Every structure is written in structure tokens, then in C-alpha cells.
Amino acid sequence: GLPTMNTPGSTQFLTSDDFQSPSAMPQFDVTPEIQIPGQVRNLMEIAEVDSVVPVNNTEGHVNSMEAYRIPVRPQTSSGEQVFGFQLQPGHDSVLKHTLLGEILNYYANWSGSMKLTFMYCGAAMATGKFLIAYSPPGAGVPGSRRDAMLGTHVIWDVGLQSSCVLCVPWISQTNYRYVTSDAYTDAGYITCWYQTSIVTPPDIPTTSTILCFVSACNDFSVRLLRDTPFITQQALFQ
Amino acid sequence: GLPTMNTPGSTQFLTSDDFQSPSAMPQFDVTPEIQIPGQVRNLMEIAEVDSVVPVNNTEGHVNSMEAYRIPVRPQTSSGEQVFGFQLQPGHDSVLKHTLLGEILNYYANWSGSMKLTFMYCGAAMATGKFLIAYSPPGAGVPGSRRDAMLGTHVIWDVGLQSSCVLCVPWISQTNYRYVTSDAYTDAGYITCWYQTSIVTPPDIPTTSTILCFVSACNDFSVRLLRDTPFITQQALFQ
Amino acid sequence: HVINYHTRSESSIENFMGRAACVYIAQYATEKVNDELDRYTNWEITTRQVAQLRRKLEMFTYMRFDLEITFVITSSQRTSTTYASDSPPLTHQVMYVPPGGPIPKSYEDFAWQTSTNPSVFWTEGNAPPRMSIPFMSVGNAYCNFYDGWSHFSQSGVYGYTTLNNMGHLYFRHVNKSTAYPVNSVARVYFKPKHVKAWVPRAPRLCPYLKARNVNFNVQGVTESRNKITLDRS
Amino acid sequence: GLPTMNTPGSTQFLTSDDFQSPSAMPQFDVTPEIQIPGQVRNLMEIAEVDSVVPVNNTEG
């Protein structure tokens, strides 16, 4: 017959190879597909829709609906902080279990700009401004409104608009950042400070609520597929 | 199926074969390369730049900076020798640990012309000449300026130029010479003698310094890749 | 600008789904010690035993994948007094029973000598036996989630288990007897290829409990932290 | 993969077969041949030149 020769790597089962196989049942007449609506062709199309972030996750608010319920109130002196978290999707325990976070955890690299959207669910007669600021990693973390005004920020009035979009820009030395975040590929800090106040006419409740959604922009991409460190089991389910 | 037949040499792992393999992670999006300056495409481009030879390696000068510090001085009678070594790069312990020498030791054959460059680091008011001579192997080694004038030589004044280039020509019976030098493929002897003197005006120090660099010319080439007999280890580094 | 880059090739459906994921670990022997680890084991085909592949499929509501089934069949020698015995190589059989067909009621039944049910014979030492099956369904997609009942009276069985009739899979040793008992382990590796996934679904938070329903325990939405506003200079 | 089938006569070492092999040292730069005089291309060219026969081979 034809003289062949066996290269190393034969009679092995790599779980990520791309080979053909003999079919078990041949000449099968499959059922014709129909126009089922809403077909998805990529995993980033799931990650480009919003999902409200559990920012107020101080214990034990995570067992209730109060995890999504960032509180604001009329102040005494301005410039105070509202909330703040690190920009570590997939690792920081604020935006880890959101819809963007559960998709990066099947991967080991991410890159691109994230989009934060807010929604002030207060009264229709209250008015106030905020200072939502992104800060590059550098050194260090800002501890004042005077410090977190030099970075990237916007100013959001709640008497004019109810929703504000903050495109967090991609600033890094590398082309990708690791999902399980180490010290080398840092990403920075998101903070939100009182610009003026919350001012309200009489007979309105004081404490209000801000929702916060996270999404992905168009330049978002992920790499190096892996399995998620969320599910665990030992024996087979019965 | 197709009738094949297994030639001898199958299911073997030669460490220097050239075969394809199934990829472990497919459809990988690699990072785009940038214009990092100074790209090297051959090992001889490293070996064509100079590196100062430790000629004065008499013990224990190799543990200091005095190994590169060939001394000259005003003489009493002329014709004396300055230095001298064998032309065995990769094996002779003068030009073995230079930049040309550490590259031949990854190989088992060399061929081509070597280039020796000098640099007189003396005073600006001193004057003198030297006789830098290459001698073919033959028989034997010269022991006088009268004997090492019949071979290839140049005459180098230090009052005119500070740097002299001596292209050592390739004279051999074979096309290649072995790096681990045996008796059959000899290469010859490099010597350097006083042509006139070192003459200096008053209030100048006597003992001066000559540096010596070794390089490769354009017709240099190496063959028969091997591993270097310089590094050694027994257990894995931890 | 910067011009840009980084195509989303690994975020695709087929690159995310096509990986040989183990779905069931079948266990059988030669000498019957007890049940289980009896000779002649079986397994009705479902993809909801292993939590790794189950969570991947349950981010989409309807799937239309083909399959690639691979077995990694290794055998260990059972503990006894002596072990010294020359033995011929073990031959293994994996028979696929379609939904409704006749089953082997025991070992040495003539259902292993049938003419329609496909079977894969394989001796120990070679490459793993890999075979492919097409899109086995009666609807037009694989319902991962079916919110309804089995009977028209709204009774009987709640869940997706009514729309799961993929068949069975029967494992046995072909060889008649060994001099000393040998326990074998067969691992089924599904690989979904030619995938079409329609309705996206929010991913599972709390870990599964059973292989037939979506019953769960209450878990908080995320891990906690100390204070809401982080602070340092 | 491609379905093949092993004809008898495989994994055998016949000492007079004509097959290719993976090279141990690849990209070797061999030395250029020179015009060495008197090249022979056949064993009968040796056998077509004379050689004096030991006819008187009676001992000793």
C-alpha cells in the first residue's frame, strides 16, 4: 500500500481538536428549522445589554432587594461621596455577578470600554447634581471631590435628565487585561460625589434611590476561554 | 479504506523534526505586533559587532578590570613583544568568552575571516609604532620581530591614528575549521611587536593601555549546531 | 484614532460550545460484586448531570446542535489476594438504544446480537472510539426550558423532562470471563457542533440540586463588602 | 480523519527498501564539491582494466 509514517501525537484525545467522525445514524431526515425569533450568534451580544449592578452590597443587604438601592439624601455640606467601587469586572464583588461579569468569567482576558448607565428613581420635584468620575490606576485612589475632578468625569443633573451614560475609556499599557485581576494590569476606580445637593420642596420623603447598570461598548472583546470558578459539584446529579 | 503501510521510523520522537500539530486553543486572536526597534534576524549579526578581548588574563587579573589592559611602556631595546595569543576562537581561553566566542560554542564548525581592532588609550603627546602580525600555522610560532615579519602584518602608528584594523585572512586546506580545535585544523598565531618605541615628552606617565576588539567579517559562517559546554546544572532551578 | 482590532472569534457560539465536555461516568465490572459496580450498566442520555456543560446550554432557551460522542474507557484491577494471571486484551461494547427499542434484560441476552441498534466495539490500547449523531428531535429545537406539563389536565410531570427522549446507552465487556475481576470506567464526552442557539437566558446563580428539575436554594445576589464608599488618599 | 487500512508488510525493516526519512540535522550547508579527477560511476569500469593473473600458483 501507500507508505505512511506516524508523527508523534497519534492515538491521543485532545479535547479541543477539530476532526471528522463516522456518523452513528446515517441518512437521517432532520426536522426543518423555523423562524424562531431573537437568534443570538455571539456571546458579546448578551454582554452588550444592561444589567443593574448591586452596588449597595453591604451585609446583609444581598439577601434582599436593597442591594440595588444606592441611597441619596439632602446633605449638610457638599462634596461628599455617594458610592464607589473598583473597575474589576469578573473579580470585584460588586459587578462580578452581573450580566457582563458572568461572561468574562468564562474567559481569561478582556479589553474595551465599559458603559455605566444611571437612573434616578426619586420624586419628580427634586433637583440635584452629581460628579461621576473615573480615575486611571496610577497612584492612588481619590479621597475628595477636589481630587476626583482631575480625571475623567461628567456632571449629571437629575432635574434635567433622569439617565446618565458614562463611557469608561480604555486606558492601559497592554492590549488586554486579565479577568482574575493581579497587580500588574490594574484598571482604576469609579467614584461618585455630590456636586451641589439634593433639594426638594416640602412633603417629599428624604431618602431616594439610584440604580446603576453596566454594559459593554462596541470595542469590547474577550479571549482565552476557560471554565467558570462559580459552580462546584463532586458527585453527579441524580 | 485506503491501503497504507508503515515505513520504519514511525511512532518515534526525533527532537529535530518539522511536523504540524493540532492546536490546543483554536481561533485565538493574537495581539498585533508593533515596531519594536532593532530586530535581529540572524545569529551572525550579533557576532559582527565588536567586543573587547581579555588579553591580559594572567592570574588573578581576570577578577578585575585589568584583564582588558594590555600594557606598553618606553623600552630599552626595540623589537620586543607586546602580547600574543593563538587564533582559536571558541577554544583558546583569551577570546573564548568574548561575543564572537560565545556564539561559535553553540556550533561545531566555523569559517571566514576575523577582524581585530585596536585602540591606544594613552596620552595625546606620545608617539610610537607597532608590528601586528598574523602567521599561518605551518611550523612553527615566531620568536622574534625578524621572524614575524615574513607573514601577514601591518604597521600601526599611534601618533597618526588611534585605531588599527587587522583583517586576519582565511588560509586553510579545508572549507571549515573545527571550533573545539584539534591538531588537524590549525589556524595560526597572532603576535604584536615593538616597531620603534614609545616616545613621550616629560610629565607623562610611563605605562599605557591598549584595548583589543574581535569581530567577524562578511564571509563568516558557522555550521553544525550543538549545545554549549559552559553552563552546567544537575537539579532543576527552584 | 486608534484603529482597532481584536476580532470576536472566540466569543462565537461554536467556539464557546465546541469543547469535549464530560457528561457521565459509567461504571461496570466483570465479576458482579454488588449493584452498582455490576457488569452491564446503562445510562439514559441527558446533558444535565455535569454542572459544567449544563450551565453553558442553559444560557440559551433553544438549541439545535449536532453531537460528537467520545469514550475514554480505562480499567483497573480489583483488589484480591493474588494478581498474577496472563489475560487477553479486553474488548468493550457500547450499544445505543433508540427511544422505544428493546433493552438487554440481563448480561448475555440476544439484544447485544441485534441487527439495528448501532454498537461500537473497541479493544483496550487504541485510540478512543469517536462517533457522531445528528439532531435527534421531533420538534424543531432542543427545549432546554419547558414551562408546562405533560398531560393536558395540567398534571403528572412539571419540567423539561417530558421533552427528553434521546434514548439510552448500554456498556458491557465483550469477553466471557477473566481470571481475576476487573472494574472498568467509561466516560462519555459530548461535543456540540453545528450549533444554533436562539433565545438568550440569564445565567444560573445558585448551584443545581437534581438532574430533572430547576429546584434550588435561596442565595444572595453577590458577595458582600465592608462599606459602600471606598476611601484612601 | 481519512479512513486508511494497513496492508501486511507494515512496521517491518527490510534492509533493501527505498524510503524517505526525517533528517536529523536540517538546513545543513554542505561543502561544495570540487573537480577531483578520475570519478568512477559503475563497478564494471573497475573490471575492464587489466590485472596480471597468478597462473603459476603451484605451492609454495
Binding site: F19, Q20, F28 | - | - | -
Partner: peptide
Amino acid sequence: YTNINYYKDSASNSLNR
């Protein structure tokens, strides 16, 4: 990327890449 098909079935093919 030779892209030849040895078998007669569609479900016996390789992945779509």
C-alpha cells in the same frame, strides 16, 4: 484548511469555522 469531506453525512462534518 484542506476542507475535504470524507463522509456522506452532514452531521459527520467538522466544526464550522
